[model samples]
Target: TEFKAGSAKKGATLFKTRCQQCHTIEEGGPNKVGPNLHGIFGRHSGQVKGYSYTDANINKNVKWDEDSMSEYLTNPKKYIPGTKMAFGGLKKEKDRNDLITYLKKACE
Candidate 1:
């Protein structure tokens, strides 16, 4: 199924509250608890340079895009078991959609 995006504006807000503490969306941003998320779209899992990733994430070898990101955001651990990310999951489809909408552009 094709993934339809929601609001990037709303997603920007969601990113601040839900993901900002752990992630950064700008290209040159520093990696914190999680790696900086620039260029996340169409990138391979654990491909970020200089940022360490768990074996589970590296071995997953998944290409990231709207669809994969949607499922992964719904439940990070569920999507990639043993991943070191501490997020509990978005739990709502709308929230994930919105967040990914922002991420698509923000992480570019």
Candidate 2:
């Protein structure tokens, strides 16, 4: 499915403000509090290098697809019991969709 680029662009901005401090997206972007998000879609959760992931995230065997992402964004702690994403999830559905779309594009 073709995502709305406009929404993705908005999501990029939102990500910069809300997520950049912890996460990175470029191929060589620094790993801050979170892992680099490059090529996150279709990737197994907690598979990124260097950063030590919690067992809750690692054991889940999550694949970063639309359904998994939507569920995680809606409620991360419930999805992964000990997840480190301190921020409350994106409450708006559009924001979650846009953010995922943006990540798919950026990571590619």
Candidate 3:
């Protein structure tokens, strides 16, 4: 299934609460608990340089996009069983849509 687009403005606010602590959208930003998500949309899993990734993360080898992101965001642990993410999944479809939309716009 395709991901539905949502408001970047709403997504920005959602990001501040849910994603900003671990992710940085600006280009060349440093990695926090999670790797810096400078350009995540078009890349594959575990592609960030200098970031140590789990075998599951590197091995999944899936490209990042609206659909993939939607699935992962819905349930990171379910999608990648060995992922080392501390944050739980985002259960709302609208929230995932907005977050992905904002990530697409801000991460460059």
Candidate 4:
């Protein structure tokens, strides 16, 4: 799916908020509250190694893609009910679009 578009610079800057606290991207990045995001693309939700995740997300079988991530980034709870991720979500589509773009680059 097409989006407004974003880059690693903007995405990293954007993630400076709540997102960075719970998650990480770069190789060997922090796997603090959430899972390390390296190799997030093409991976299924809740499958990241050694990361404890809620049953809802662990069993969702949802694929990570631009479209899927777009919906989830809008509202983590709404997208996957009972997910352990505690976040209100990104209201701006630009933020979501760019964040995913950033994840793709940084998390690789």
Candidate 5:
């Protein structure tokens, strides 16, 4: 993990209001504006099947670990440079921590 441990409960709250619109954390969830985020904890970006990610033409070799995830969450453009995500970014540290926690937990 990037930062030690995090609270899944806090992350859940943050996800519903801020992330559920475009990102889906449940398994077999729908891919809407962005890629479905389920299983993203250990998966690679731009690899979600059935989702159209024409803009994410970067290297698919990067794994979605916490350090990478946190960096991406802080700023999608800075992380991937050519990502398809539209949301600006999460500016708070706690929000990022909790959101990552939820991303890790929701799929299980």
Candidate 6:
């Protein structure tokens, strides 16, 4: 099912508050510890310009879809053996859903 516009907006707000420190969705926003998330879904993993990803991530063949992202957000290190994302993980299922919905909408 498609995400509602209001849900995406709420997710955007959550992202700004909880994720802006290390990630960005705007075209020119700076890449902090993590790579910019612009056009993340449907794009190849660890392929962002300028930001360097770990060998584990670069070597892994996966696309950033809803299910993969949900799993990754729940456990970054476990999902991508040697990823550099430092956050422990977003444990809440709702937050993960919202965040992915926001990312898909914002990048489009």
Question: Which candidate's TM-score is highest?
Answer: 3
Question: Over the full model, what C-alpha lDDT does candidate 5 score relative to the true structure?
Answer: 0.77
CA displacement after TM-score superposition, residue 89 of candidate 3 (Å): 0.8
Which parts of model 6 have CA positions greater than 4 angstroms off?
A: 1-6
Residue 86 shift from truth in candidate 5, angstroms: 0.8
Give the higher-TM-score candidate: 3 or 5: 3
Q: RMSD of candidate 2 to the true fold?
A: 2.4
Q: Using TM-score, rank the candidates from best to worst.
A: 3, 1, 4, 2, 5, 6
Instruction: For residues 1-81, write the lDDT of model 5, one tens digit per residue.
Output: 446547889888888888888878788889888778777767766688888885553464568787887877798777777
lDDT for residue 36 in candidate 4, whole number 0-100? 86
Off by over 4 Å in 2: 1-6
For model 2 the TM-score comes to 0.89
Residues 31-79 of candidate 3: C-alpha lDDT, one tens digit per residue: 8889999888779999999999899999999798889988998999899
Compose the digit string of candidate 1's lDDT tens values, residues 1-108: 456789999999999999999988897999899999898876899988888999999999989989999898888999999999988998888888888888998988
For residues 1-108, write the lDDT of model 2, one tens digit per residue. 333333788879988988898999998887789999888885999898898898988898898877777778778898888888887888877888888778778888
Evaluate candidate 5 by giving its C-alpha RMSD to the native, one decimal. 1.9
Separate clash counts for every candidate: 0, 0, 0, 0, 0, 0
Model 4 has an lDDT value of 0.82
Off by over 4 Å in 5: 55-60
